[PDB]
């Protein structure tokens, strides 16, 4: 693998046009491209994969947020603790209305995507994609349980279909699941013992971080509750 360090020279020649991305920084004065994080450089597209527990607002990202406040203009939703609030408009719901407002209390789990996210402006999310049949699991998440994981474990789970988690958990139990890019995973089952079994697995899988240890953990966790 090719490991990258901040401040190091950029291997990619400046001759051929290359689109930017997360992980690299374009100097507003010297106009030189330099890495600002530590990880593996992926060139297809140029970006850097680095370990981070803190999520930042970005366009077209699926996130699971919690309503921390209800205003007259929009909703105040926290995608993560201590981070700045996000603006969820009333018109950001399917079958929107003028006078009539969507029913959401403080503490309700919402599965939405980030539409407009500026660095110097308050981010905004919408409870309907733009668009994928208006139903990618978007909306209020009733009951269930959520778990905090690092951003590395969250993105690989949602995007990569070769990740042996949804594959190994589907065999142990039948359930619906929603994964956000802010390190939040929402899983709901029928019986509470199944949800608890799923929580303990992801908690241990994220800690150990091993692709081939998924089946081993899931086997001993589901047999522990019985």
């Amino acid at each position: 693998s090719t490991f990258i360090f901040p401040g190091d020279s950029f291997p990619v020649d400046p001759t051929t046009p290359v689109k930017l991305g997360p992980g690299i920084y374009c100097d507003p004065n010297t106009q030189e491209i330099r890495p600002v994080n530590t990880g593996v450089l992926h060139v297809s597209t140029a970006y850097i994969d680095y370990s981070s527990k803190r999520y930042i607002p970005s366009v077209n990202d699926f996130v699971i947020g919690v309503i921390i406040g209800t205003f007259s203009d929009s909703y105040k939703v926290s995608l993560q603790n201590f981070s700045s609030s996000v603006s969820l408009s009333y018109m950001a719901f399917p079958n929107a209305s003028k006078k009539n407002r969507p029913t959401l209390q403080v503490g309700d789990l919402v599965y939405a995507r980030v539409c407009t996210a500026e660095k110097e402006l308050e981010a905004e999310i919408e409870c309907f994609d733009s668009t994928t049949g208006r139903d990618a699991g978007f909306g209020i998440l009733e009951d269930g349980m959520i778990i905090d994981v690092n951003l590395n474990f969250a993105r690989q789970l949602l995007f990569n279909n070769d990740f042996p988690l949804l594959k190994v958990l589907a065999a142990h139990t039948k359930f619906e699941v929603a994964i956000g890019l802010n390190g939040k995973i929402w899983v709901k089952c029928e019986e509470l013992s199944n949800t608890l079994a799923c929580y303990r697995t992801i908690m241990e899988c994220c800690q150990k971080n091993d692709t081939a240890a998924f089946k081993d953990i899931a086997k001993r966790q589901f047999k522990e509750i019985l």
Partner: protein
Amino acid sequence: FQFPEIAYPGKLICPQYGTENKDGEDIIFNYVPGPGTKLIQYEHNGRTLEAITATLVGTVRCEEEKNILVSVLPGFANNLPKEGDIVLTRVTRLSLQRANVEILAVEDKPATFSVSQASSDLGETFRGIIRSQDVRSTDRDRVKVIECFKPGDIVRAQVLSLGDGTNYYLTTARNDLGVVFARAANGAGGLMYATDWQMMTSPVTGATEKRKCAKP
């Protein structure tokens, strides 16, 4: 003027009312207090008396407008943002429906300016808010605030209404108002200059950012 030219705080200048004889008719001079003066009450011969008394050390000026105005000019405080004045401000934060700033200097009248000295790391500096509808006369309804102003950019505006005792309400609707001084990437890059009214370019790194520019 038959009245003392130099006046220290507490020095008597002129009584309440005055009159003179000219052209076979009595002309009534009405003395009114002004900046640096204060109408107070004195006692003498067992009888009350009201007279204009200077409260600031400086020279006395008697002027008339289309009545005699008595004011004392020192050798800032008097200058305060009022409806119609032009004010140089700096962007403190950006929201979606508006843009709040802080007042630095105020344009005088016939350029010269009056710099308001205050601590910017406390919040004692006067704060002002520019509404999204007050950005430009062109398309007042839909205006993208991100493509107009920027944190740190200097904006020349004109105050409409003072509102409450917290924030001032400015506007950049006209041509001579808008972002004056700004740099690339929120101040990280080089200096940028105003070319088009809705476009600001930088003749150094070749960077171009969308702002609300004024007329040179």
